[PDB]
């Protein structure tokens, strides 16, 4: 028989941060300009999608087929600083950080943990070190230009630009896949206190990796933890413990849309011709509205709603046809998931119901 479990994710404990931390990146290619290797946003809900299908040879070629997607809030993302990393015979070593002369209340509120009692003195000496000349800064920058075979940039989100209310910014580091590390840090230095799209990293007809932390479910025992049957000790004998809130990594994820907040009628295919953003009736379920850019990707990401995720651009040069097919949407369901949704727009609600006692 098989074993009622895997063995790879074996120390089934909770992770240490809700930010699932990037561990891998595709290595480099020092011929291109710089391309950001990752991005991050906040998962919001699911929808259903039909899609006409250019899949040569498949049974469903040139047919409509319904599939199911998710959605994530993807505001613009501002850069605040960089770090270098050098190869050793130990591994890698953080040797310098540098920050960007003016920092948001959000990230100042991240590094502090009890905000309002704080004097909010986070970088007041660093901005003073940003002198008339920036001498020490350029000292500790050109160092990295010399050293630091590979380099990362810090980001933070603009979370006030979401329906969510947490007030706090989720830092991260992001690796680059350009060359000319001097050019990398020069590019980033120009990008200091400057923000970046998600259609400026990704596009359609793309595959991604989705790394996040799962929904928690508490201390569920064997019968629902491992799907094991019901009536010294070894470490693979299917004993009860914590489920959920593990980190995971989900790959081979076909994007269909790279949305846009300013673009009205985000739910518009070529077919619908209806001025509706994808935010369906009722708001999202435990998430609010989508008045920003977004992504529509098939399958189902690890997470729960109003949870953060991190994105990576598939980490290698894929080989399957499905990694290269050309997407064409036909219709977005835009109904409320707060019930068995029937109607896309409240004007359609008015139209099919008619006028009512409260209407006049």
């Amino acid at each position: 028989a098989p074993r009622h479990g895997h063995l790879g994710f074996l120390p089934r404990k909770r992770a240490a941060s809700i930010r699932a931390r990037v561990k891998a990146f595709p290595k480099d290619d020092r011929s291109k300009p710089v391309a950001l290797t990752s991005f991050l946003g906040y998962k919001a809900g699911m929808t259903t999608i039909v899609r006409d299908l250019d899949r040569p040879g498949s049974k469903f070629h040139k047919r409509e087929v319904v599939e199911a997607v998710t959605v994530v809030d993807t505001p613009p993302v501002v850069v605040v600083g960089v770090v270098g990393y050098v190869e050793t015979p130990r591994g890698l070593r953080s040797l310098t950080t540098v920050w960007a002369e003016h920092l948001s209340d959000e990230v100042k509120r991240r590094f502090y943990k009890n905000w309002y009692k704080s004097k909010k003195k986070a970088f007041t000496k660093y901005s003073a070190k940003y002198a008339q000349d920036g001498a020490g800064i350029e000292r500790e920058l050109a160092r990295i230009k010399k050293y630091a075979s590979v380099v990362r940039v810090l980001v933070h989100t603009q979370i006030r630009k979401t329906p969510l209310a947490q007030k706090k910014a989720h830092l991260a580091e992001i690796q680059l896949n350009g060359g000319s590390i001097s050019e990398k840090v020069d590019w980033a230095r120009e990008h200091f206190e400057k923000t970046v799209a998600v259609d400026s990293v990704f596009e359609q007809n793309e595959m991604i990796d989705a790394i996040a932390v799962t929904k928690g479910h508490g201390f569920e025992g064997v019968t629902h933890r491992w799907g094991t049957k019901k009536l010294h000790v070894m470490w693979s004998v299917a004993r009860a413990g914590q489920r959920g809130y593990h980190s995971r990594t989900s790959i081979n994820h076909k994007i269909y849309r790279v949305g846009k907040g300013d673009d009205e009628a985000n739910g518009a295919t070529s077919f619908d011709r209806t001025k509706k953003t994808i935010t369906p009736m009722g708001g999202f379920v435990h998430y609010g509205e989508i008045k920003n850019d977004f992504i529509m990707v098939k399958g189902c990401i690890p997470g729960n709603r109003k949870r953060i995720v991190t994105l990576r651009k598939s980490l290698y040069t894929n080989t399957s046809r499905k990694a290269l097919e050309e997407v064409s949407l036909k219709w977005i369901d835009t109904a409320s998931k707060f019930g068995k949704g029937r109607f896309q727009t409240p004007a359609e609600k008015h139209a099919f119901m008619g006028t009512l006692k409260k209407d006049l």
Binding site: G57, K59, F60, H61, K62, R63, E64
Partner: protein, 227 residues
């Protein structure tokens, strides 16, 4: 006359359909059977990659002639639209509403006359004569009720399953108005509508169809310039 193989199946008229003025084809697998048909006929008439509710089976879910065409309730606006865009407007197109949908299974038709179920509805029985100008008859063959499956017709000739007795053969040749033969296809495959297809200037059959079978269908359908 040519034998032809769908993907590994010898039954053609379940996966494709023919008329004198056009031809239909499924999209299962790779684009080789369409090339097979156009190798014989070419651009003399439109040959159209078509589907029915995403199904491969047009050859038995459809019935028509060079004057008009019919499709059952299950087909979709997209396929209907594509049929009119592909085909010239000289030929009719129409979507039918019935209880049952096995149109090519239950219609063996040529350009002037066609046969149908006994229990088929009189509304569509009127409508088919309205759209095709053909004389309609509600009969069976040796008690075998599916008419569009076990018969293949043309204006040159026709064919029926082999179990038909000779009294049935003659009294049906009366109704059908071509010479008939109680014949076979692919070493005795009873299902002749799918085992082969025929119009006034071509026949198509599976690879298993033998040389006596080719000879009798060639004679009865009078297909070469010396028959």
């Amino acid at each position: 006359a040519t034998r032809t193989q769908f993907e590994n199946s010898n039954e053609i008229g379940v996966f494709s359909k023919l008329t004198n003025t056009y031809c239909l084809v499924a999209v299962g697998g790779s684009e080789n059977f369409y090339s097979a048909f156009e190798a014989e006929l070419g651009d003399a008439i439109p040959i159209v990659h078509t589907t029915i509710a995403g199904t491969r089976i047009i050859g038995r879910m459809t019935a028509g002639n060079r004057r008009g065409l019919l499709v059952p309730t299950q087909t979709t606006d997209q396929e209907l639209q594509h049929l009119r865009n592909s085909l010239p407007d000289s030929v009719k197109i129409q979507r039918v509403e019935e209880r049952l949908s096995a149109l090519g299974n239950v219609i063996c038709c040529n350009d002037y006359v066609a046969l149908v179920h006994p229990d088929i509805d009189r509304e569509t029985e009127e409508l088919i004569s309205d759209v095709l100008g053909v004389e309609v008859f509600r009969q069976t063959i040796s008690g075998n009720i599916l008419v569009g499956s076990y018969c293949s017709l043309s204006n040159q000739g026709g064919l029926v399953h082999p179990q038909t007795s000779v009294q049935d053969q003659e009294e049906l040749s009366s109704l059908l108005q071509v010479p008939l033969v109680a014949g076979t296809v692919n070493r005795g495959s009873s299902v002749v509508g799918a085992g082969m297809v025929v119009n006034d200037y071509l026949a198509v059959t599976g690879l298993d169809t033998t040389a006596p079978e080719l000879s009798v269908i060639e004679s009865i359908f009078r297909l070469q310039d010396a028959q």
